[model samples]
Target: NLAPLPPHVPEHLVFDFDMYNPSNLSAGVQEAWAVLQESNVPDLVWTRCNGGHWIATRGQLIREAYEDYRHFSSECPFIPREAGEAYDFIPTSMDPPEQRQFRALANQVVGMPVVDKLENRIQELACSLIESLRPQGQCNFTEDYAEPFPIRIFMLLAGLPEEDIPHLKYLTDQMTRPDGSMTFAEAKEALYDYLIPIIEQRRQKPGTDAISIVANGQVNGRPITSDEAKRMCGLLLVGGLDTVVNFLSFSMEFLAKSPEHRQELIERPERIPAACEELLRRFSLVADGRILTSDYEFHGVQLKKGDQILLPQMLSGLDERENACPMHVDFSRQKVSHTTFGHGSHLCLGQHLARREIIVTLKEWLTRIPDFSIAPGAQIQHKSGIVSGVQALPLVWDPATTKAV
Candidate 1:
């Protein structure tokens, strides 16, 4: 049951912006959100856009709200109201005491142990993918490597067929950045429909896959229900399919244009881990905001209960107030603080796996094709939503420069 918007929000701050407008979005979907950050917007602002919500522009406020879940609820975590209404996942949509129960299950599969087990496979996949594209001296980084790499790894983890990826990815994208072919409601239903049978199959007889493990596992000291299992599986599919795919494209595009940054990594491969952290900071790719649970005044702004807020997970570390030249990539920087994965109890449970994928890609790609940039005359583009991303990243390099060992 959703509540009506509170009365204290100023109508002027509420500006409606259609997220799917193709013409204005040429710069990228997230460009609009970036526009707000450029002017040093206050810690919080209200936007009527996307069903009228608040936008938390700084790291401190965003972190505070995420941590202090009492005042800010995650029950309906997304804007447009539809996404919130449709969101019923275990840990992500669940707050505090209730949410903690499922964290252990999420950890069992995407935790450090799982990452360690898949580390070599991740490295090998990255190397193989880079090697295949090295000879071309040109490739669309998004489709060539970004999309397939992480999703394929996720497919393996969930024990789903790779052939099912096209449909699942398409549906997931529609939910965040609808193409008009499907409404937010439609996409949610499609994903739920797709997972129902899979959950049943896994439950009837569990397997070694992550999904099966969760299906057969317990939550709060009791066996999980089929519906609960389905929702959990749906969230995993969404997280596994969308987040990393977009992140990989963003990181590759940054590496393509920022030669100095790329060189820093190439020069000292050991810094790859730090470079990954820096890049995640510079490219805060996801937007996960919370709704105010009650009326309150902070920093002279009075926000009421039921008023929505947009806390872009991507904006935090980029603020110059927090980091020196927040926009610039500094691999050697001693402290790189950002919420790229997320913060608080909701801080991405799959972060270990995500980091492993990133570290492996960075090491393998640089070793194979050390000097590559945006293809000559190619126009790069970006997009935004729950998970902002690059539309395409065409790169060209000299075959002669390719490493041979």
Candidate 2:
């Protein structure tokens, strides 16, 4: 359903692409978005589908918009206006200077140091999870492995019970991939409600867990408020539960379909890290954007104050201008470029943890289940929104080919 085009939007610059439901979604999530970069589309265009916001179709513009945070504020980061208005997570919803203060504390939980501390546990869990599935001869990668591997590790770090995963993941998924049962505000508030009590308890009797650290931590020589803790904890929960969880499914689905790609990794295990980088580039899937701070001319197009523009991080590496053979997954590319983790100050704090989970999954899975493919009759389906994901990946394999280790 298209909204009335704003008076300031030029008639010719409209492209009615829906971020939540791209027309070509059944083909592939990333492929659906790639349509924007098709030769005919303008670098910047307006889509009235999500209440009439702009879409930056090229990497050049996307990177610039992200870098120039002054012009493109994170205050309202989602589309359809209402969701962005409801979005109030810390560090992410706040811009630099102010954004930086909370970002430091947020990093205290998910930063690289945490990943380093949990390295052995990350590897152990990946091995244990993959080994358990190897004997089954088949598994739904999304359910059987993708969800548990990262979500469990994150829950352990945050000191939350593993039993609560279903409830929490469902709420997080609603924010990114809504089924319309709950509005964004409803889902967000529910998450906040769940966090509010826990945050209060953590502050009273602080533990060394991630949540407690943030809850009891300080900001700018002052004690952080309970409300601030809930907002930031909400962000961490969503990041922990969603980002890498879906990413692994996408990477695994690619490997399941492309045997030769799998073969390269099996024979040259040392290239796993390089392959991880390339895969992140090819399957990059985050697309949230910022609101225009004021009216401005951008790449020959006029953007008005308060107009939201989606600068998809997924499009950066896919842009042919940024990488030759942008669609191809070459492990040895001289430079693999993408804002998969995002760009500028608010770049994903958990990126180090995400990479570790990815690399560990790729290495451990291939080691045990060297050969696998999508279920013979199964058709992989992808869901798209701010975060894109595989619905279910029914993967099949020969038990005889698997190793017991």
The prediction achieving the highest lDDT against the true structure is 2
The stretch of ten residues in a row with the least summed lDDT in candidate 2 is: 97-106
Error of 1 at 402 (Å): 0.5
C-alpha lDDT values of all predictions: 0.80, 0.93
Candidate 2 Cα errors over 4 Å, as ranges? none
lDDT of 1 by residue, 27-141 (tens): 6554555555666355677765567677887788888888988888888888767787777777888889889999888888889999888887788788888899999999988
Q: Stretches of candidate 1 above 4 Å error?
A: 1-7, 11-32
- Candidate 1, residue 157: CA error in Å? 0.7
Q: Worst lDDT window (10 residues) for model 1?
A: 14-23
lDDT of 1 at 361: 88
What clash pairs does model 1 have? 14-48, 15-48, 28-382, 29-383, 29-384, 54-308, 54-309, 54-310, 284-314
Taking all chains together, each candidate's TM-score versus the true structure is 0.94, 0.99
Q: Distance from true position, residue 126, model 2, in Å?
A: 0.9
lDDT value, candidate 2, whole model: 0.93
